[PDB]
Amino acid sequence: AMLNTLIVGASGYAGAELVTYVNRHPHMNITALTVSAQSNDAGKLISDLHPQLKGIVELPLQPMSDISEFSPGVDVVFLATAHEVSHDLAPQFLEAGCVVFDLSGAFRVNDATFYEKYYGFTHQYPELLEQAAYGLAEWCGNKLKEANLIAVPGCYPTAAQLALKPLIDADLLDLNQWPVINATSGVSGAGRKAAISNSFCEVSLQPYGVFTHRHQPEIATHLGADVIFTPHLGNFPRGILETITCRLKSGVTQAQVAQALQQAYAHKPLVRLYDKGVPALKNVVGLPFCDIGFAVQGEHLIIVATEDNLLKGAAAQAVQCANIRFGYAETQSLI
Amino acid sequence: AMLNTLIVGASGYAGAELVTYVNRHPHMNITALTVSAQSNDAGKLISDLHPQLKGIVELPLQPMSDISEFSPGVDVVFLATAHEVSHDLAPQFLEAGCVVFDLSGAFRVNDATFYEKYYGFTHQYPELLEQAAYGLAEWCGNKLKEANLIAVPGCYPTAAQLALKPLIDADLLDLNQWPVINATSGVSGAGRKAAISNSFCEVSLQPYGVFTHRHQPEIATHLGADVIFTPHLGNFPRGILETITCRLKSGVTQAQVAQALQQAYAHKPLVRLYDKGVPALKNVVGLPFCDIGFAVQGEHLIIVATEDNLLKGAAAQAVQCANIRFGYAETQSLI
Amino acid sequence: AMLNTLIVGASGYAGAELVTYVNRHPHMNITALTVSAQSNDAGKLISDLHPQLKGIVELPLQPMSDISEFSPGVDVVFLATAHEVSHDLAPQFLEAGCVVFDLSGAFRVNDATFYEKYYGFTHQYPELLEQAAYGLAEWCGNKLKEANLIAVPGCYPTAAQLALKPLIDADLLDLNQWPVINATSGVSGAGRKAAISNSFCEVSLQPYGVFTHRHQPEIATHLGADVIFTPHLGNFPRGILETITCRLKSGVTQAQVAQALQQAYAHKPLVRLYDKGVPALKNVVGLPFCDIGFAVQGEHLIIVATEDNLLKGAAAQAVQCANIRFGYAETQSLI
Amino acid sequence: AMLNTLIVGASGYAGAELVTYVNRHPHMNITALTVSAQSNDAGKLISDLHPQLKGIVELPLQPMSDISEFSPGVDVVFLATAHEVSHDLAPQFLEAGCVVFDLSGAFRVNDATFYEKYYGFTHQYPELLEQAAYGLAEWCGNKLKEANLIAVPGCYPTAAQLALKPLIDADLLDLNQWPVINATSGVSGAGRKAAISNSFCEVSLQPYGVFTHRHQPEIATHLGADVIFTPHLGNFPRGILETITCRLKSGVTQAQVAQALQQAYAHKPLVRLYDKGVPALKNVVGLPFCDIGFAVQGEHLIIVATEDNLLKGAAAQAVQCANIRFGYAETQSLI
Ligand code: NA
Ligand code: NA
Ligand code: NA
Ligand code: NA
Ligand code: NA
Ligand code: NA
Ligand code: NA
Ligand code: NA
């Protein structure tokens, strides 16, 4: 048995990486790759837009308006789409009996104001918000193993929570000093699109979304702790490195922080813990891992987490959740 | 006395570099910087779009529809605009008594088919074509010293002709084998614009305009010799490196090629001739020079020419011609 | 049954990519990874130097002086070493009964002067030169299927010959005009090493080895045709793009060139032929393919070939040959 | 009158930028450029190593052992050298009557343990430590206007203190929460040198000097406040961007922070204050400025400061101090 898999928004950068993994996956194959109804890319091959897939996957991109053209007989739907589209589509696919893995921010947080403030829309499916599993794979339980709607976390929130969650859960941080998360992403995180801001000559190094980015409250809500989160656009296509600075609870030691991380991740295959030193970004790009190292001096902690923004930050985590949902090896198709 | 200077298309990448030099120039200053009538940037400061100019030049960008708003009392007009715009505007500014330095391809070659084939328009000003000085500064005579319309050469044609012209003029090449010019440009050569092709993640290394680029016939017409010309888009913002491979006329030697170049360029300040070895691109970026080195083995020549595509390839050559036209030191404002 | 596999020079950049593939390969595993006798990296883990391998392969790097420490029971030896080392070691491993896949230039060409001129040493194993299979995988016959010494071609020669060989073999080029091969490589092609020339700030774009590079005569000897070959160091870590300009034999057409390439490569899985247009480098980096596109106008041909310099240009071709030698699927471990 | 100017360590990256400015400066010219006694670059031209200077400055690099070969008649000495060399040389040049501008860390902080802990040497000139002016140009008074020894601040400390000093001096920060300074530098900050760590393929994005970097205590001592300082090596040659996160003193507002910065910098020409938004690194590279923007939400401040690491972070600040010391326009030669 193989899972029929629909990939919506397949022509974007995250979408291309989903096509790669699902094609490769021994237990899944693709029914269709869709674009929007009036997409200029309708009828082009996936490999025309993403030539790394030439000779590997060459499915045409089909324009989708009514989802009934694409829902019957589909086991898994990946929504590699922005929130408005995912808000509209996900309920329809669930009703058609599909298990939906939404990469958008649309179902990530069970809260109305969250959507009004940071996404600028009123959320129309409160029941789904309650039902959605937050697909932070290393930490999800069996709301996931048996959810039919999985909200895959954002790229920056993924590294951030992998670094911070075990420490906060062990009460190792003095949260009266909000953790400061500074992160730099490659430009693929902006999406495939012609805009001035992601135009080649416009990229160097700059912070953005200062005190405004929608990933900040996602990280704060899910960790149960206020944080500073400042993203930066760097002049490379792929990867996120996060440098995270905290005040430890008084008396907390290096060995104590190491114990908490060793216990969280030693049997988690997609998290690579550095015993000493801190990871370099190149060492994870094109791989599905999150790499984590840290240092302690006195009452301060600096923890550093890297990932490929399109892999553990998007497509690989999505597929990793599908593996958990459907009972396959957790890393199946990823490594 | 100072020259009143209008810069049309000031908000583009070449335009910003013209603003820098003209501001700096002791004998010129700026009356206005214009954008198109319905430009989204109308009313923004030049330094909002190009923050390297913050605190240096902060003139607002004015939308221009009727040129009579901007022509009276203007000594010099730089058209940092594409050919259609330059075709329309340049005749009007000349009639208003301005000396026009057009950066577009619109007046570069005295030939009708040239425009139909490579620019896809029928040229409406044959007399101007006859009158335009081709602003390849090291080689222009007194059609320039006294022209009122200067067509500034394209960026790739500039390095190409500086390398090849003295050799062809000394009959040192066997032109039965067309020179092969392979060049790589930084992405600023594509212009300021949101398109997929110059989007950050879409750039790596690729040839383009293969047997179609409009700079090929400009180079061939002006050199009086058929050439292969293949440009490549590289993943850096600024600079052009050209590697040019020729068959020498039988018996032609290294010393003979060196003599021809030494004689062409020894007293030309913006051309830096390498006695031995070949230039690296970083050594000219942000400078107004063209750097040239070469090697000979047997009957083959390899000559290598670099420039900053926006400086000697665009703005600096434009200003260099203005210096010649108006009698200032050739390098005034450039270095 | 699995092949015991020794990787000599494992700590270099090509060596790391061999470790990755051989680890992954279902029919091979690694006995040891070696460094030189007094290497500063002796005793470090492979994944300390190449952290992309963390949690995947963590074999220590062992210093090797006498090969008898490492030869018994070894089926396959990869020499990821420079020519002098490979010249000394390969004969010893062959005598111990190992099948040797040398990545160096040491056994690539059956000719003495070749070694004196371009490698600056007199070759001491003429019989081995006669015996070595040249591992250009798409073109090798059964000198390979049954060779015990395979000389893996250089990175630039690989793309060059894949583009040119089928055309020359079909007499489609006028070789009175030598093909001009201009290529740009990422800096990994320089090897892992601290030198000024591959130091970060020293890299931009520059030709090198002008009329001197050792890959030129390898390409010319094996193609049976004189060529110009000029490599360039570009400011990126991985990939080679070659732009190759030829004069066609009189009367030769686009369709005729396409037929020759379609017939050469249609059933060759690691060569991806572009029907129209020319490949972009990013689309092959991290993949084992060589991508080829071309254009014809009049009597000129421009053919463009890309590869990952460490994969099809080094490690993947090495492993591909091993697959052919030992009877595994040609792409086994590569894709 | 012109100042005779000696540049020691001229062949390094900062040294090359000093040569550029001093050459250009109307009131200074160069007596000699020196390298170490057994330097491999002795006798090479400055422009051989730094070809951007070809045809502009072509002084040979002279090996210096005894300083009496180079001290008589010299008005100004720039030491573009590391601390041990500067510790040894600066006292000798001062004794010869030269005004010394040391770019090393050797005289930056009046404290012995500082040198033992972070520089691993016992400082032999306590009187000089007392006499040295700290050349943070916007803040220096008349210990500078009349010092004969100027310790030019480190590159990262410069942006950091320009951002933080006016805020701390106005008591606007709650220093019970140490400011967190995360910074990314281009690889030129590592110096000209062949090492693995600054080799092209070894650079991507990585923190370094975590809780160990010598710039941390320099920043903390001079600000009179404990800080976290974590530098990162990024994959570009030039520039530093610092993102600095603070807890404000209770009640402190955006307008209050803006007032303090406007008052500090409005008449300081090399500091470009952003009224709204935060600077992008490309907009300062190759320029002598420090660009500063900031945002406030609630009780947190994020202030962002950029500079060219070799210009305002090194050579331009050095020259700026010389201008102040000798009474020239502050920006003379810089812009
Ligand atoms: Na599959
Ligand atoms: Na783990
Ligand atoms: Na001016
Ligand atoms: Na010259
Ligand atoms: Na294996
Ligand atoms: Na094929
Ligand atoms: Na001077
Ligand atoms: Na200011």
Alpha helices, DSSP H, located in C121-242: 126-131, 142-145, 155-169, 215-223
Is C285 at the interface with chain B, CB within 8 A?
A: yes
Centroid of ligand 2 to alpha carbon of A288 (angstroms) = 12
**What's the token pair of residue D70?**
């180079």
Whole-number Å distance between alpha carbons of C191 and C52: 17
Q: Which chains sit next to B, with 3 or more Cβ pairs under 8 A? A: A, C, D
Start-to-end CA span in chain B (Å) = 22
Burial class of residue D194 in the structure, from the number of CB atoms within 10 Å of its CB (0-12 exposed, 13-18 middle, 19+ buried): middle
* Cβ(A276)–Cβ(C58) below 8 Å: no
Largest CA distance in chain B: 62
SS3 category, C52: helix
- Which amino acid, residue C5? T
**What's the token pair of residue A109?**
């947080």
Please enumerate, as own/partner, the contacts of B325-332 that have beta carbons within 8 Å and a separation of 24 or more: B325/B99, B325/B144, B325/B145, B325/B146, B325/B147, B325/B150, B326/B3, B326/B27, B326/B76, B326/B99, B328/B25, B328/B27, B330/B137, B330/B269, B330/B270, B331/B269, B331/B270, B331/B288, B332/B25, B332/B26, B332/B27
* H helix count then E strand count, chain C: 10, 14
Whole-number Å distance between alpha carbons of B44 and B67: 20
Whole-number Å distance between alpha carbons of A300 and A180: 12
Is C44 at the interface with chain D, CB within 8 A?
A: no
**What's the token pair of residue A256?**
């104590």
Whole-number Å distance between alpha carbons of D113 and D108: 13
* Cβ(D27)–Cβ(D332) below 8 Å: yes
* Cβ(C284)–Cβ(A55) below 8 Å: no
Is D98 at the interface with chain A, CB within 8 A?
A: no
* H helix count then E strand count, chain B: 10, 14
* Cβ(D82)–Cβ(D11) below 8 Å: no
**What's the token pair of residue D15?**
């040294």
Cβ partners under 8 Å of residue A266, min gap 6: A273
Spell out the domain ranges in chain A.
Answer: 1-153+314-335, 154-313
* Cβ(A99)–Cβ(A325) below 8 Å: yes
Other CB atoms within a 10 A radius of the CB of residue D169 amount to: 13
* Cβ(A292)–Cβ(A160) below 8 Å: no
- As a dihedral over the C-alpha atoms of residue D19, residue D23, residue D25, residue D26, rounded to 10 degrees, the angle is 160
Cβ partners under 8 Å of residue C208, min gap 6: C231, C232, C233
8 Å CB contact of B199 and A201: no
Where are the strands (E) in A19-153, listed by range?
28-36, 61-64, 76-79, 99-102, 133-134, 149-151
Other CB atoms within a 10 A radius of the CB of residue D133 amount to: 23
In the beta sheet, which residues pair with residue D61?
D33
Listing from the earlier edge strand, what are the strands of the sheet with B149-151? B61-64, B28-36, B3-8, B76-79, B99-102, B149-151, B133-134
Whole-number Å distance between alpha carbons of A156 and A146: 26
Taken as a whole, chain B contains a residue count of 335
- For residue D283, give the nearest of B52, B282, B291 by CB distance: B52
Query: Which residues of chain A have a CB within 8 Å of the CB of C279?
Result: 51
Helix H, strand E, coil C: the string for D112-132 is HHHHHHHCCCCCCCHHHHHHC
- ∠ CA D160-D162-D168, nearest 5°, is 85
* Cβ(D131)–Cβ(D147) below 8 Å: yes
* Cβ(A245)–Cβ(A255) below 8 Å: no
**What's the token pair of residue C48?**
């300390």
Pairing of the two strands A76-79 and A99-102: parallel
Centroid of ligand 6 to alpha carbon of C273 (angstroms) = 6
* Cβ(D234)–Cβ(D185) below 8 Å: yes
* Cβ(A93)–Cβ(A64) below 8 Å: no
Q: Which residues of D256-270 are buried (b: 16+ CB within 10 A; e: fewer)?
A: bbeebbeebbeeebb
Q: Which residues of C122-158 are buried (b: 16+ CB within 10 A; e: fewer)?
A: ebebeebbebbbbbbbbbbeeebeebbbbbbbbbbbb
Closest by CA to C271, choosing from C303, C296, C225, is C303
Cβ partners under 8 Å of residue D20, min gap 6: D53, D56, D57, D315
8 Å CB contact of B335 and D56: yes
Is B145 at the interface with chain C, CB within 8 A?
A: no
- Which amino acid, residue A210? V
* Cβ(C86)–Cβ(C132) below 8 Å: no
Start-to-end CA span in chain D (Å) = 22
**What's the token pair of residue B146?**
């006294």
* Cβ(B50)–Cβ(B80) below 8 Å: no
Whole-number Å distance between alpha carbons of D57 and D51: 10
- For residue C52, give the nearest of A50, A269, A283 by CB distance: A283
- ∠ CA A155-A157-A159, nearest 5°, is 80
Is C203 at the interface with chain D, CB within 8 A?
A: yes
Residue D65 has phi, psi (to 5 degrees) of: -115, -65
* Cβ(C77)–Cβ(C148) below 8 Å: no
- As a dihedral over the C-alpha atoms of residue C216, residue C220, residue C222, residue C225, rounded to 10 degrees, the angle is 170
User: Residue written as tokens 């059933």?
Assistant: C267
Q: Which experimental technique did the depositors report for determining this structure?
A: X-ray
Whole-number Å distance between alpha carbons of A79 and A56: 22
- Which chain B residue has the Cα nearest residue A193? B196
- For residue D206, give the nearest of A205, A280, A297 by CB distance: A280
Whole-number Å distance between alpha carbons of D176 and C15: 51
* Cβ(C183)–Cβ(C232) below 8 Å: yes
Centroid of ligand 1 to alpha carbon of A52 (angstroms) = 17
* Cβ(D167)–Cβ(D326) below 8 Å: no
Query: Which residues of chain D have a CB within 8 Å of the CB of B286?
Result: 286
Cβ partners under 8 Å of residue A103, min gap 6: A9, A14, A78, A79, A80, A81, A86, A152, A314, A315, A318
SS3 category, B232: strand
User: Residue written as tokens 């890297």?
Assistant: A306
Ion ligand 4 — residues with CB under 5 Å? Answer: B 265, 268, 271
Whole-number Å distance between alpha carbons of C99 and D274: 66
Whole-number Å distance between alpha carbons of C248 and D131: 76
Cα-based distances in Å from B302 to A315, B65, B244, C216, C248: 47, 48, 6, 15, 21
* Cβ(A167)–Cβ(A248) below 8 Å: no
Other CB atoms within a 10 A radius of the CB of residue C97 amount to: 12
Cβ partners under 8 Å of residue B184, min gap 6: B205, B231, B232, B233, B234, B240, B241, C184, C205, C234
Whole-number Å distance between alpha carbons of B309 and C226: 34
**What's the token pair of residue C63?**
């210093």
Is A112 at the interface with chain D, CB within 8 A?
A: no
Cβ partners under 8 Å of residue C292, min gap 6: C162, C163, C261, C265, C271, C272, C273, C274, C279, C303, C304, C305
SS3 category, C216: helix
Element (H, E) at D163: helix D155-169
In the beta sheet, which residues pair with residue B231?
B183
Kindly write down the DSSP assignment for every residue of B119-163, as one continuous string.
TSS--S-HHHHHH-EE--TTT--HHHHT-SEEEPPPHHHHHHHHH
SS3 category, A101: strand
- ∠ CA B74-B79-B83, nearest 5°, is 145
* Cβ(C286)–Cβ(A286) below 8 Å: yes
* Cβ(D104)–Cβ(D82) below 8 Å: yes
8 Å CB contact of C54 and A335: no
Whole-number Å distance between alpha carbons of B237 and B191: 11
Whole-number Å distance between alpha carbons of D331 and D334: 5
Where are the strands (E) in chain C, listed by range?
3-8, 28-36, 61-64, 76-79, 99-102, 133-134, 149-151, 180-185, 205-207, 228-234, 240-247, 271-273, 290-297, 300-307
Whole-number Å distance between alpha carbons of D158 and B286: 25
User: Residue written as tokens 């010129």?
Assistant: B28
Q: What is the number of alpha carbons within 13 Å of residue A43 lying toward its C-beta? A: 2
Centroid of ligand 8 to alpha carbon of D232 (angstroms) = 27
**What's the token pair of residue C45?**
């883990």
Pairing of the two strands D180-185 and D133-134: unpaired
Closest by CA to D17, choosing from D236, D330, D315, is D315
Whole-number Å distance between alpha carbons of A8 and C78: 44
Is A205 at the interface with chain B, CB within 8 A?
A: no
Cα-based distances in Å from B231 to B215, B235, B303, D223: 9, 13, 16, 52
Listing from the earlier edge strand, what are the strands of the sheet with D180-185? D205-207, D228-234, D180-185, D240-247, D300-307, D290-297, D271-273
Taken as a whole, chain C contains a residue count of 335
Element (H, E) at B207: strand B205-207
Centroid of ligand 6 to alpha carbon of C290 (angstroms) = 9
In the beta sheet, which residues pair with residue C231?
C183
Please say whether the structural domain D1-153+314-335 has been given the CATH code 3.40.50.720: yes
Where are the strands (E) in B25-120, listed by range?
28-36, 61-64, 76-79, 99-102
User: Residue written as tokens 């300081």?
Assistant: D268
In the beta sheet, which residues pair with residue A3?
A28
Kindly write down the DSSP assignment for every residue of A275-299, as one continuous string.
SSS---GGGTTTSS-EEEEEEEETT
DSSP code at position C176:
T
* Cβ(D45)–Cβ(D68) below 8 Å: no
Known catalytic residues of D?
A: 155
The CATH number of C154-313 is: 3.30.360.10
Whole-number Å distance between alpha carbons of C86 and D58: 43
Whole-number Å distance between alpha carbons of C294 and C276: 7
- As a dihedral over the C-alpha atoms of residue D317, residue D323, residue D328, residue D333, rounded to 10 degrees, the angle is -50
User: Residue written as tokens 């959740």?
Assistant: A321
In the beta sheet, which residues pair with residue C33?
C7, C61
Q: What is the number of alpha carbons within 13 Å of residue A286 lying toward its C-beta? A: 12
SS3 category, B64: strand
Helix H, strand E, coil C: the string for D79-94 is ECCCHHHHHHHHHHHH
SS3 category, B258: helix
- Which amino acid, residue A13? Y
Cβ partners under 8 Å of residue B35, min gap 6: B9, B10, B11, B41, B42, B61, B62, B63, B64
Report resolution in angstroms: 2.0
Whole-number Å distance between alpha carbons of D223 and D130: 18
Whole-number Å distance between alpha carbons of C96 and B264: 64
Kindly write down the DSSP assignment for every residue of C271-302, as one continuous string.
EEE-SSS---GGGTTTSS-EEEEEEEETTEEE
- ∠ CA B89-B91-B96, nearest 5°, is 95
- As a dihedral over the C-alpha atoms of residue A228, residue A231, residue A232, residue A233, rounded to 10 degrees, the angle is -170
* Cβ(B283)–Cβ(B266) below 8 Å: no
User: Residue written as tokens 């319905």?
Assistant: B38
Cα-based distances in Å from D20 to B292, C204, D33, D311, D333: 22, 21, 12, 11, 9
